[PDB]
Design a protein around this ligand. Sequence first.
Ligand SMILES: O=c1ccn([C@H]2C[C@H](O)[C@@H](COP(=O)(O)O)O2)c(=O)[nH]1
Ligand SMILES: O=c1ccn([C@H]2C[C@H](O)[C@@H](COP(=O)(O)O)O2)c(=O)[nH]1
Ligand SMILES: COc1ccc2[nH]cc(CN(C)C)c2c1
Lengths: 287, 285
Amino acid sequence: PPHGELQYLGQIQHILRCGVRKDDRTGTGTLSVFGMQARYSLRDEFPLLTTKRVFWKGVLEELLWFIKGSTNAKELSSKGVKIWDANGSRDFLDSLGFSTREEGDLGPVYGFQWRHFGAEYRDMESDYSGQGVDQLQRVIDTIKTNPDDRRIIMCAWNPRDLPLMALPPCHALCQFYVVNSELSCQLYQRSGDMGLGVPFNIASYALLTYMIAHITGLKPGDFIHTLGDAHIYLNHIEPLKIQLQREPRPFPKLRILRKVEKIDDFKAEDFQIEGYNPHPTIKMEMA
Amino acid sequence: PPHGELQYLGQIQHILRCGVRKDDRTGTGTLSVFGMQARYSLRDEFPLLTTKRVFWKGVLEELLWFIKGSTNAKELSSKGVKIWDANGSRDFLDSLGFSTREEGDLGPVYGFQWRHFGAEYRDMESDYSGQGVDQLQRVIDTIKTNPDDRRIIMCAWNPRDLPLMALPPCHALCQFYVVNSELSCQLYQRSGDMGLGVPFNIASYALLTYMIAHITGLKPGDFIHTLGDAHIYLNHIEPLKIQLQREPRPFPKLRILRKVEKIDDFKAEDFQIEGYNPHPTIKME
Ligand SMILES: O=c1ccn([C@H]2C[C@H](O)[C@@H](COP(=O)(O)O)O2)c(=O)[nH]1
Ligand SMILES: O=c1ccn([C@H]2C[C@H](O)[C@@H](COP(=O)(O)O)O2)c(=O)[nH]1
Ligand SMILES: COc1ccc2[nH]cc(CN(C)C)c2c1
């Protein structure tokens, strides 16, 4: 029964062989394919990629940050995780015409949409209690009361709020599904950096599925990863060709160390990655 | 290496062999798989399924109805296409607590979202000019000025408006992509009836892609169909097993009979399906 990581590596091989040259905003260039799908099992395994070490602390702190409803990059930065800091910087905010906005205010991004979809975004420090649709909690309620429902969806893509965001969301939406006491999740990702982001993104939503499964007393099932523009940056090709030489090691397991009743109560210390034996990281430039 | 209609037929075979028995809202029951994807080429071909005749007039009138921004089921019904009528009926509207709403008012469904996303929905007859985001026109503008953009998206799923809709959308969102003068489209469909709906749905978005390609002077590329809950109802299994035994005929072509500048100007008579040779329909409840 073949290792789950071979699907990701397979997508890299497909983009390298069949992808087409395409320019982007940074003028690095890409090889790109439109429309891909991979399926990663979550049964007695957690799909944290082994051919290159994935930044696990980042995955976990960012997810907890989303779940709090936070849109303050400084709040994620306090936890050791810098991945949203460039997008919240005075310079980057000024380049979007948000001169009046405080540093770190990303606008109504993921945290805001999951917890207060459709509320009037004022700033990051504001009180949004009871405003908008709490999509995350409604997903959890529906899994509990009506698991066979086909509307268990969480949408981050909000065309009305897009002009206020520092970055339009990659993770447009995700859908949940229940059968035989197993919870699965599909993610529609409109744009995927296969070198840097994708492994991280797989881990983010695998972890979300494990958390919701625990709250609802279900077993994790599959994570389905669907991509729109799936691209490799040209400066990542040599690093990626190195990574493709590495045999994957078995995926680790994720233990949840205590019983937890509401999703708001999860803390970083509640999670233990057990058996993670990645090969060494390879450097790959971003902005 | 399987192509065209063989992808759809392949998904039917996969659900029949690997799908899991599941109850649904109606308690008829289904075989179901979660997460599927198919790729249909649009280059010198139009993916209107041949193993069972697809209701072409319905596809076309409904798409033009969406594009107008209409949310009035009676307006689609006037054109011979009844598929939204049950959802706009006085009884069905009363069962959702919309006793004050006129018959046919489906609420803020596709039409409204594509043209006025985020506007305050009052009723179907109201004037929504300049209100909300016009996602359809913004897709067209972006394809013209910045084809390499990865944000060319049209979203029908609006959690704030869901409680006002007669039906929550199947077609959550769709995304466009341009490379080498070819326009492609991916559709995220959260729930797919593989027997009745899916063939129709493929045709709907293939046609949308052809229309936008024409306005933007691009050639059609691929249509990618992504599904969430992909199911076959149990009463459709015997009919579907019959359909799987039919050899597909080549896909037809779609001609666009005149030059058209804005997407609002397309009319039913502008479109010609040429070479369509389907097998006879099979009935499905
Ligand atoms: O969680 C994320 C956030 C961003 N990106 C990527 C994809 C693109 O390479 C780039 C953003 O491009 P745009 O689609 O925003 O234009 O960063 C990811 O892969 N995952
Ligand atoms: O254009 C459409 C509209 C609806 N359906 C389907 C899927 C389900 O069988 C049913 C909707 O059920 P829910 O997913 O809303 O629960 O209708 C389609 O396939 N295509
Ligand atoms: C309060 O007005 C708003 C603000 C942001 C929004 N995003 C989506 C909607 C949809 N709504 C008009 C029903 C919205 C409304």
